[PDB]
Design an enzyme around this catalytic site. Structure first.
Site, PDB file in Angstrom:
ATOM      1  N   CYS A  15       0.830  -1.182   0.000  1.00 28.22           N
ATOM      2  CA  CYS A  15       0.000   0.000   0.000  1.00 28.22           C
ATOM      3  C   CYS A  15       0.861   1.227   0.000  1.00 28.22           C
ATOM      4  CB  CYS A  15      -1.002  -0.054   1.193  1.00 28.22           C
ATOM      5  SG  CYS A  15      -2.157   1.341   1.102  1.00 28.22           S
ATOM      6  N   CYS A  19      -2.426   4.231   7.037  1.00 28.12           N
ATOM      7  CA  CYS A  19      -3.498   4.391   8.007  1.00 28.12           C
ATOM      8  C   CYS A  19      -3.170   3.662   9.301  1.00 28.12           C
ATOM      9  CB  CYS A  19      -4.800   3.776   7.429  1.00 28.12           C
ATOM     10  SG  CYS A  19      -5.228   4.458   5.794  1.00 28.12           S
ATOM     11  N   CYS A  22      -4.928   0.339  10.166  1.00 31.33           N
ATOM     12  CA  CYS A  22      -5.113  -0.639   9.072  1.00 31.33           C
ATOM     13  C   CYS A  22      -5.137  -2.055   9.608  1.00 31.33           C
ATOM     14  CB  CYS A  22      -3.961  -0.490   8.084  1.00 31.33           C
ATOM     15  SG  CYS A  22      -4.114  -1.628   6.618  1.00 31.33           S
TER      16      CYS A  22
HETATM   17  C1  LIG Z   1      -7.684  -2.597   4.239  1.00 33.67           C
HETATM   18  S1  LIG Z   1      -8.675  -1.706   3.071  1.00 33.67           S
HETATM   19  C2  LIG Z   1      -8.047  -2.165   1.400  1.00 33.67           C
HETATM   20  C3  LIG Z   1      -8.427  -1.285   0.162  1.00 33.67           C
HETATM   21  C4  LIG Z   1      -7.820   0.160   0.115  1.00 33.67           C
HETATM   22  N1  LIG Z   1      -6.438   0.162   0.639  1.00 33.67           N
HETATM   23  C5  LIG Z   1      -8.626   1.044   0.998  1.00 33.67           C
HETATM   24  O1  LIG Z   1      -8.196   1.450   2.106  1.00 33.67           O
HETATM   25  O2  LIG Z   1      -9.769   1.342   0.591  1.00 33.67           O
HETATM   26  C6  LIG Z   1     -10.389  -2.369   2.893  1.00 33.67           C
HETATM   27  C7  LIG Z   1     -11.399  -1.503   3.710  1.00 33.67           C
HETATM   28  O3  LIG Z   1     -11.208  -1.749   5.115  1.00 33.67           O
HETATM   29  C8  LIG Z   1     -11.286  -0.546   5.879  1.00 33.67           C
HETATM   30  N2  LIG Z   1     -10.452  -0.734   7.058  1.00 33.67           N
HETATM   31  C9  LIG Z   1      -9.082  -0.724   7.157  1.00 33.67           C
HETATM   32  N3  LIG Z   1      -8.730  -0.946   8.457  1.00 33.67           N
HETATM   33  C10 LIG Z   1      -9.901  -1.062   9.178  1.00 33.67           C
HETATM   34  C11 LIG Z   1     -10.165  -1.266  10.548  1.00 33.67           C
HETATM   35  N4  LIG Z   1      -9.196  -1.382  11.472  1.00 33.67           N
HETATM   36  N5  LIG Z   1     -11.487  -1.419  10.909  1.00 33.67           N
HETATM   37  C12 LIG Z   1     -12.497  -1.294  10.006  1.00 33.67           C
HETATM   38  N6  LIG Z   1     -12.265  -1.083   8.653  1.00 33.67           N
HETATM   39  C13 LIG Z   1     -10.969  -0.970   8.307  1.00 33.67           C
HETATM   40  C14 LIG Z   1     -10.679   0.433   4.876  1.00 33.67           C
HETATM   41  O4  LIG Z   1     -10.839   1.783   5.208  1.00 33.67           O
HETATM   42  C15 LIG Z   1     -11.280   0.015   3.562  1.00 33.67           C
HETATM   43  O5  LIG Z   1     -12.550   0.631   3.366  1.00 33.67           O
HETATM   44  S1  SF4 Z   2      -6.669   0.950   5.037  1.00 37.67           S
HETATM   45 FE1  SF4 Z   2      -4.664  -0.154   4.973  1.00 37.67          FE
HETATM   46  S2  SF4 Z   2      -4.589  -0.973   2.916  1.00 37.67           S
HETATM   47 FE2  SF4 Z   2      -6.289   0.736   2.771  1.00 37.67          FE
HETATM   48  S3  SF4 Z   2      -5.130   2.710   2.323  1.00 37.67           S
HETATM   49 FE3  SF4 Z   2      -5.091   2.526   4.559  1.00 37.67          FE
HETATM   50  S4  SF4 Z   2      -3.050   1.496   4.953  1.00 37.67           S
HETATM   51 FE4  SF4 Z   2      -3.569   1.081   2.818  1.00 37.67          FE
END
Ligand SMILES: C[S@@+](CC[C@H](N)C(=O)[O-])C[C@H]1O[C@@H](n2cnc3c(N)ncnc32)[C@H](O)[C@@H]1O
Ligand code: SF4
Ligand SMILES: Nc1ccn([C@@H]2O[C@H](COP(=O)(O)OP(=O)(O)OP(=O)(O)O)[C@@H](O)[C@H]2O)c(=O)n1
Ligand code: NA
Length: 289
Positions: A15, A19, A22
């Site tokens: 990525c 975040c 994440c």
């Molecule tokens: C890990 S992300 C992968 C796709 C892309 N990187 C993104 O952030 O949209 C998939 C979804 O999970 C949400 N997400 C990530 N970490 C999370 C958390 N700890 N609890 C709930 N949703 C989460 C993200 O904001 C996103 O909408």
């Molecule tokens: S939620 Fe995780 S995978 Fe999606 S943009 Fe943020 S750091 Fe990247």
């Protein structure tokens, strides 16, 4: 036997954002050869998969978006899937990609946790070094221009828990607005070797409820508390192993590429009742929108 009707394929863990909460972190850089990914998607369709969502990681970071494009085209044109979607941070989606692949994409979900750029900095919705400005609005406009359904995803966390997003959601008009309570997954955003630490981001169930109540006027809102989110997805990792979250981690099955779908599915931890309760089966093909 549970049919894998709607499946997430986190085909990369790489990525460009950072975040802080994440839950699907950059623990590896492995990505399957595209032909192996296609064999997994084929056997999933044969098992009854009707919707696939490409996730990660950031799906548009791999091979400049060409890998996710080809998988979208394969699923729509060769597998004839009713629904093909992506979830993306939006920062790397370009007009040439949309012109090539948007006819094959039913839904594009962009993650936006705040309309306040200081909050996005605190959260880590930013690239290190250079940065993009209004990726969200530019992607939203491309979805209208190329006729893809626009979806928005938001994580409720400490730094947006009082935010009133109503006027912004009204302007963007998503077909579906998923609002997730920040979720802890051991080995991802908790634990000694975890790449992220969600602790500072977590909200109480009541603070989550107050964020939902603040936005109850928006008919597109799809809330997912930790209870509704944790086990209600079919989640394939970058080796096409199902990840079981019931024990609070992301525990992989064997790869469907080695054992087949039905065998691996027994170890998915999927809670199909919860999938139905949260609204996981919905009007998801663009002919019907
Ligand atoms: C890990 S992300 C992968 C796709 C892309 N990187 C993104 O952030 O949209 C998939 C979804 O999970 C949400 N997400 C990530 N970490 C999370 C958390 N700890 N609890 C709930 N949703 C989460 C993200 O904001 C996103 O909408
Ligand atoms: S939620 Fe995780 S995978 Fe999606 S943009 Fe943020 S750091 Fe990247
Ligand atoms: N324990 C969990 C629960 C969910 N997810 C991931 O969180 C993302 C949630 O995004 P969402 O937009 O809800 O996924 P879709 O399957 O596209 O949702 P829907 O079909 O309901 O619109 C998905 O990539 C999913 O696999 C995860 O990594 N760990
Ligand atoms: Na980790």
């Amino acid at each position: 036997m549970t049919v894998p009707v709607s499946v997430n394929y986190h085909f990369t863990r790489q990525c460009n954002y950072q975040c802080g909460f994440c839950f699907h972190t950059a623990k590896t850089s492995f990505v399957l050869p595209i032909e192996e990914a296609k064999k997994g998607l084929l056997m999933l369709m044969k098992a009854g998969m009707e919707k696939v969502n490409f996730s990660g990681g950031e799906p548009f970071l791999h091979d400049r978006g060409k890998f996710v494009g080809e998988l979208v085209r394969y699923c729509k044109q060769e597998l004839e899937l009713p629904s093909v979607s992506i979830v993306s941070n939006g920062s790397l989606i370009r007009d040439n990609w949309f012109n090539k692949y948007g006819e094959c994409l039913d839904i594009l979900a962009i993650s936006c946790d705040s309309f306040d750029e200081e909050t996005n900095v605190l959260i880590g919705r930013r690239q290190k070094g250079k940065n993009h400005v209004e990726a969200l609005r530019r992607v939203r406009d491309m979805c209208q221009q190329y006729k893809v359904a626009f979806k928005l995803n938001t994580v409720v966390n400490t730094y947006n828990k009082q935010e009133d997003m109503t006027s912004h959601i009204q302007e963007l008009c998503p077909v579906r607005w998923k609002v997730f309570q920040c979720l802890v997954i051991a080995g991802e955003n908790s634990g000694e070797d975890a790449l992220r630490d969600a602790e500072q981001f977590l909200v109480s169930n009541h603070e989550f409820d107050q964020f939902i109540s603040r936005h109850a006027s928006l008919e597109c809102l799809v809330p997912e508390s930790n209870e509704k989110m944790q086990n209600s997805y079919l989640i394939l990792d970058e080796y096409m192993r199902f990840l079981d979250c019931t024990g609070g981690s992301k525990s992989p099955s064997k790869s469907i590429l080695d054992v087949g779908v039905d065998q691996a599915m027994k170890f998915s931890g999927f809670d199909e009742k919860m999938f139905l309760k949260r609204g996981g089966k919905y009007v998801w093909s663009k002919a019907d929108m």
